[PDB]
């Protein structure tokens, strides 16, 4: 029984993904992990993506579970509709949903899925950008004042054509910046100008969030508590003294604390479940708050970047730096950007409340601008992206693939590294293709690792986490 409506939602939810079983996977332990955001609390797990050394088959869910489930609603629509305006939401979708899977593997199945051959990272992307300007093309050609006619049909803009070209300019913008290390990166920047100047999300009104009448990703979170905050970005909001911290977190209230309280990220503590549970913060979430997929503090990050880089993003770097945290503050109902933004106040150090992974501070980064500009490229591309990440949470997969393109913000390293080809200072670049790719899908899989291969500025090993993505290129 195909039903539009259902079909959407259904590519709506595996963008930041609503089911449970799928979330824990993408998000809560890879995103979650590797962003610095999120620790397990599961004493009693020794196969982490936290220490690098996932359990075979819970590599499964992020490749696997994504492109099976994607491709025949997918098709659906394809052989359903032929109206301009449901093809091009639909691609639109396709290509939301696969960014990230391409961002955490390189090489993918996208192109002659119809299991099958893999495209190259590069392939991917361009491909990807020329389904965007189809998508956009009939957009623009087709909405109209009124209704759209998918005002039932759609929980993240309810019908409204006008808000989904903002949000597709403005992910043709993170897309492009992305690739400013890659031979690229000439097309990136004109790919970026042409978006802004097309109009991107300049609103918070404008964001694009995927609402749900149950958010199920709260079990996880809530009642299974598998998970809580990790000590990254408690460092870095902590020292900050961010006024968008009781918007963010619980507090953990004791004998022995009052507070704000992340746990190291990657480690095997000797304690109990209960002990992880109650020591730390937990994310502040409803079972009934949507999935962010992108706001516009991000956007403005992404043109305070640009703006730094010299294209022509509409404005200073400056500006848009600041009206970025603005905006997030904004998002969050917080108050105090205009002072913060005058922060000298650094990164704090890590204490962990139970004593067992105190460290030193990951960073010393301030909030206020350094206004030499392009003088201190270095340092203020690092506070761009250290207030997109604080922005971002909890969106963990965008983060850390920020983090692995431009370095930061810098986290606190893994103690307990159980990688296989994998660094412990510069930590997991990619993960790793599932088993069944190798059992099922050897041929294509065998071809896809050369392709990783070749495309790589750091091989390591091949297909292990070690190995850099074809965007990933930064020299440090
Ligand atoms: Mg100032």
Not at 238 to 244: I, K, L, S, T
Not at 307 to 314: D, H, S, T, V, Y
Not at 386 to 415: C, D, M
Request: aromatic residues 12%; contains cysteine; charged residues 25%.
């Amino acid at each position: 029984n195909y039903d539009l409506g259902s079909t959407i939602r259904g590519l709506q939810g595996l963008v930041i993904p609503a089911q449970e079983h799928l979330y824990q996977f993408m998000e809560a332990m890879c995103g979650g992990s590797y962003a610095g955001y999120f620790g397990e609390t599961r004493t009693g797990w020794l196969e982490k993506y936290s220490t690098y050394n996932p359990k075979t088959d819970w590599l499964k869910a992020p490749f696997t579970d994504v492109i099976s489930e994607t491709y025949p609603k997918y098709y659906a629509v394809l052989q359903h509709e032929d109206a301009p305006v449901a093809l091009a939401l639909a691609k639109l979708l396709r290509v939301t949903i696969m960014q990230r899977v391409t961002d955490i593997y390189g090489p993918i199945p996208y192109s002659k899925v119809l299991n099958a051959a893999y495209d190259s990272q590069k392939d991917v992307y361009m491909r990807m950008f020329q389904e965007l300007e189809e998508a956009d093309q009939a957009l623009e050609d087709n909405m109209t004042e009124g209704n759209s006619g998918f005002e039932k049909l759609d929980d993240v803009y309810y019908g409204k054509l006008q808000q989904w070209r903002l949000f597709l300019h403005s992910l043709q913008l993170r897309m492009a910046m992305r690739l400013c290390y890659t031979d690229m990166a000439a097309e990136a920047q004109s790919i970026a100008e042409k978006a802004v100047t097309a109009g991107v999300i300049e609103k918070n009104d404008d964001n694009a969030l995927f609402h749900v009448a149950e958010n199920r990703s709260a079990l996880c979170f809530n009642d299974w508590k598998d998970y809580r905050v990790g000590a990254d970005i408690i460092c870095y909001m902590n020292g900050y003294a961010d006024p968008r911290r009781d918007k963010y977190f619980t507090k953990v209230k004791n004998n022995d604390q009052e507070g704000y309280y992340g746990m190291r990220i990657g480690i095997n503590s000797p304690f109990s479940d209960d002990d992880m549970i109650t020591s730390y913060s937990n994310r502040l979430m409803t079972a009934s708050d949507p999935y962010v997929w992108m706001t516009a503090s991000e956007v403005a990050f992404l043109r305070a970047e640009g703006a730094l880089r010299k294209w022509n993003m509409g404005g200073e770097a400056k500006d848009f730096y600041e009206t970025g945290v603005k905006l997030s503050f904004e998002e969050h109902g917080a108050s105090g950007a205009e002072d913060y933004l005058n922060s000298i106040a650094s990164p704090s150090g890590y204490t962990d409340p139970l004593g067992s992974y105190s460290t030193g501070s990951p960073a010393n980064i301030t909030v206020k601008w350094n206004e030499m500009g392009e003088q201190a490229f270095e340092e203020n591309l690092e506070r761009i992206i250290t207030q997109k990440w604080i922005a971002l949470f909890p969106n963990g997969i965008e983060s850390w693939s920020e983090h692995r393109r431009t370095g930061y913000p810098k986290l606190l390293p893994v103690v307990v590294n159980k990688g296989r080809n994998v660094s412990t200072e510069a930590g997991m670049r990619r993960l790793m293709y599932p088993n069944e790719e190798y059992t099922q899908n050897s041929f294509h899989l065998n071809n896809a690792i050369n392709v990783l291969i070749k495309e790589s500025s750091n091989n390591q090993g091949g297909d292990t986490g070690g190995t850099h993505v074809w965007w990933d290129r930064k020299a440090n």
